[PDB]
Amino acid sequence: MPQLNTTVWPTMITPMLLTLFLITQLKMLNTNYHLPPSPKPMKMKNYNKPW
Amino acid sequence: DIDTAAKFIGAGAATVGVAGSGAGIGTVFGSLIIGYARNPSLKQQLFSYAILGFALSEAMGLFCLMVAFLILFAM
Numbered sequence: 026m027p028q029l030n031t032t033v034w035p036t037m038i039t040p041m042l043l044t045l046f047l048i049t050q051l052k053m054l055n056t057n058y059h060l061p062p063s064p065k066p067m068k069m070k071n072y073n074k075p076w
Numbered sequence: 077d078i079d080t081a082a083k084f085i086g087a088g089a090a091t092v093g094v095a096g097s098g099a100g101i102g103t104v105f106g107s108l109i110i111g112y113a114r115n116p117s118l119k120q121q122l123f124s125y126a127i128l129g130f131a132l133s134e135a136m137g138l139f140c141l142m143v144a145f146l147i148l149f150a151m
Contacts, residue, residue, distance in 0.1 A: 026145070026146060026149050026150035029150055
């Protein structure tokens, strides 16, 4: 069983630790979801009529 | 050799343990049939659980086969 060959373990561990925790996490961080456009048709600070 | 012989015997034995996964998937998909026949509006969601259910049943089955090969080749 090749899986049991403990000679070549680090050459599997290292690049996985690199691509799962650094590269892929970054390629995610670049993917952002902006909040939806919410044109507010009610916003008017008009003081009381002067009076 | 007696070793090789016992490897074959233990392989067949450890293989027996797949009947559990067989019955497990049988039960899971039977229950999925019933649950869908009851509340079909949830079909999609139900199906999800089914797969997951299946995904663990085969899980245990896998272990059996594991020892099988892990005796047949690795030992």
